[PDB]
Chains A and B, each alone.
With several copies, the nearest count.
Chain A
Amino acid sequence: HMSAEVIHQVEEALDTDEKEMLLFLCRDVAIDVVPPNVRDLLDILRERGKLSVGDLAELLYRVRRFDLLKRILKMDRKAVETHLLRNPHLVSDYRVLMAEIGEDLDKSDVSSLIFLMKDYMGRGKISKEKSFLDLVVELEKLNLVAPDQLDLLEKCLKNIHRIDLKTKIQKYKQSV
């Protein structure tokens, strides 16, 4: 349903941050494997049928690469929005919320979040260099953040005075 040329275009056009975000977002679809790079992940999704033109459109939309949505897939924002309104979503709203929270944090906020969560985890699991999504992943492995367990992340966002992000979490919780 997808050709190797489109996949190649996507992998080389994305940057490191966008690749990490794509891996984090697809952590739910490919439950079993940790793909080392994004090309292995996209090919695995194609093999499992989870990479149509609409699926790649959704993936490009979540990483906010509209230039790739237009150059590679020849689509507009309204088209992918209508597709998501029409068909089921590949990435859950929980992952999208986590990605938005990560994108609305500067370096100091992420470091302080890592410090506060360090009380709940070990040290060597995450160093000062890690991103917010890496923190969310390491907490998920410890069952400390989840779609049904957002109280700790909510409290930590309160403790870093990011009440708007607490409101984002509350709005997500009010949709379920």
Chain B
Amino acid sequence: DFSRNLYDIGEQLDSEDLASLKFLSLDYIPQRKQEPIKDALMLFQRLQEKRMLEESNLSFLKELLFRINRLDLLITYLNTRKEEMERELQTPGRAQISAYRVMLYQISEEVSRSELRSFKGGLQEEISKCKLDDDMNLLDIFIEMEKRVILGEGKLDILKRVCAQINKSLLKIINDYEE
């Protein structure tokens, strides 16, 4: 039953949703363990190995599904409404994902293709030249920035520069996260 439910939830996630989940799980699943994850069941089993996903602890899975805006999966397979998740994640202590990760994902969801071109253009001097090809999305650029300690919870200056050069709502997201 439980395994069939996890399999069915995995069958509803495409490669982009899977990339989103892997980015949201960077603070719990390291790079080496993340590399061979090509479907949702592998990430689910990696969470099971850390006991963050069991038949009596669906909290982190529900949080992951809520953060990627798959409310349909939450209501269908986990029997959870949007208001329930909103009330749960804003209670002190229950948030398992860091606000930094959520703000990075939200900024990635608000950047179109041309804005991504300009964002990649802005970072021409802080990333090696082969690692700035079209084959990367904004989350991979965020990961590569974190690897070079130019982006982080205390280092928002370069992100703020690029976003201010691009758009105002991104600066609003950054400043709303900061407070």
Contacts and interface: CB of A to CB of B under 8 A. Distances in A.
B3 A118 contact: yes
B77 interface: no
Interface string B21-65: 000000000111101000101000100111100000000000000
Contacts of A161: 33, 49-50, 128, 147-148
Contacts of B131: 12
A12 B129 CA distance: 7
Q: Which bracket fits the contact residues of A?
A: 35 or more
Q: Which of B7, B35, B133 has the most CB of A within 10 A?
A: B7
B60 to A, nearest CB: 13
A13 interface: yes
> Interface on chain B toward A: helix, strand, loop, or mixed SS?
helix
Interface string B1-32: 11110110000000000000000000000111
B31 A13 contact: no
Interface string B102-141: 0000000000000000000000000011110100000000
Contact of B129 (A14, A70, A112): A14
A167 interface: yes
B88 interface: no
A153 B133 CA distance: 28
Contacts of B48: 67, 164
Contact of A163 (B3, B35, B149): B149
Contacts of A105: 31-32
B134 to A, nearest CB: 10
B72 interface: no
22 contacts: A12-B128, A12-B131, A13-B130, A14-B129, A15-B130, A64-B49, A66-B50, A66-B51, A100-B30, A104-B31, A105-B32, A108-B39, A112-B41, A115-B6, A115-B45, A116-B1, A116-B3, A116-B4, A119-B1, A161-B49, A161-B128, A164-B49
Given A115-B6, A116-B3, 10 more contacts: A12-B128, A13-B129, A64-B50, A105-B32, A112-B7, A112-B41, A119-B1, A161-B49, A163-B50, A163-B51
